[PDB]
Amino acid sequence: MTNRLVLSGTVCRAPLRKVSPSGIPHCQFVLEHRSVQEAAGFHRQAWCQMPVIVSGHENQAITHSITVGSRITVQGFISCHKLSKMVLHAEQIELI
Template identity: 75%
Template structure:
């Protein structure tokens, strides 16, 4: 039985990236992506908005993660996973496997 777990999201980085290296030497970059769009549902247009925590892991992603800052627009694709916070609450986190910078038109 196949199980799908793919998420594609674009938006603006709204929380400063936090860069860490795990005890096993794997670099991680965590940030929050804010998405806003207009979607059609049941024949009606509606505003869609969310803030999604994103984590990017691995050396091959370091070049792009070192260049991202708050206010940048990006496109991310990866899988989602539940992470338990220090407060004991679970939250969905997007584990990015692909990231592209989007020209914001400024």
Template identity: 45%
Template sequence: MTDNCLVLTGELVKAPTVSITPAGIAHCQFALEHRSVQVEEGMSRQAYARIQVVATGQWSQNLSRELVAGSKVKVSGFINRHESRNGNPILVLHAQHIEMIN
């Protein structure tokens, strides 16, 4: 199996954080909140999700200057399992493309 693709629009909950690994690789991390109305079996339902997003590489440093709390974006990439600091598993969206939405 190779398919692992997610596209999600939403709003940044707070300003992103940028970190540099010991190998010199930049990471930009932020939480994305999505709210919408989806139709399921002919019925409308509220959809809500909050997911951590990480963008890796040089482009992420440039991106972090544009992103502020409240920014609306469309993120596409793949999901991967990470562990929180207390050892709990979480899904993280690894961004491959981020588009600002006006």
């Protein structure tokens, strides 16, 4: 049922843009997250490079503010395909 990743980071690859044959715009970039997280009472570095996909006409405009160096937070669902790779499908983007 529940599937929600909220993740902040710095964009490490600029949006690569395409439109589907049926007219659906898709925007793809990579978000690099790095932070200090808490577990069992000791601090530890969390690092990951998350591919993000922005699909549909709704969220495309803000995507043109996103460049390598942009700090953003992305809220959405994760999806894996296969040798498996994970993508964050953006539902909300906040420009920090």
